């Protein structure tokens, strides 16, 4: 009894400068079809010492009218393929305002490397796949 859906978030004018980027940016909401609204939450720069060289990615339950779900995050490169995918082993319990994710999703050093093609035209494209347990 699983409902699986996804959302592609393109972040424009990506910058490594906090005073320009903001410490926290969220995507617009999305769902499977569905009253449950979800959104992605990114910390361009990890908000703690252990994740300071990383970009943090979380899945947030915006509105809930109490829910368990698995998720997977991946970056879409310049040619549309999935890379640096990170998925939760199990499902986690979400309630309104609660998030789950990886504070060390990807190295801020990796994004800079143009060789990876992770920031085409200063655009970061993230793809999230959510599986809600019924």
């Amino acid at each position: 009894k699983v409902v699986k859906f996804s959302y592609m978030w393109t972040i424009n004018n990506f910058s490594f400068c906090r005073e320009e980027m903001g410490e926290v940016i969220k995507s617009s909401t999305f769902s499977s079809g569905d009253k449950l609204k979800w959104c992605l939450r990114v910390n361009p720069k990890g908000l703690d010492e252990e994740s300071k060289d990383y970009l943090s990615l979380y899945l947030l339950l915006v509105s809930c009218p109490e829910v368990r779900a698995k998720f997977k995050f991946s970056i879409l490169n310049a040619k549309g393929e999935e890379t640096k995918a990170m998925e939760s082993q199990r499902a986690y319990r979400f309630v309104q305002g609660k998030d789950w994710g990886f504070k060390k999703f990807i190295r801020r050093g990796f994004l800079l490397d143009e060789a990876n093609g992770l920031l085409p035209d200063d655009k970061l494209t993230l793809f999230c796949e959510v599986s809600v347990v019924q």
Binding site: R41, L47, Y58, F71, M86, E87, S88, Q89, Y92, K98, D99, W100, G101, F102, K103
Partner: peptide, 9 residues
């Protein structure tokens, strides 16, 4: 990998 949350509980 193991997921984490920005909040406790």
């Amino acid at each position: 990998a193991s997921a984490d949350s920005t909040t406790e509980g």
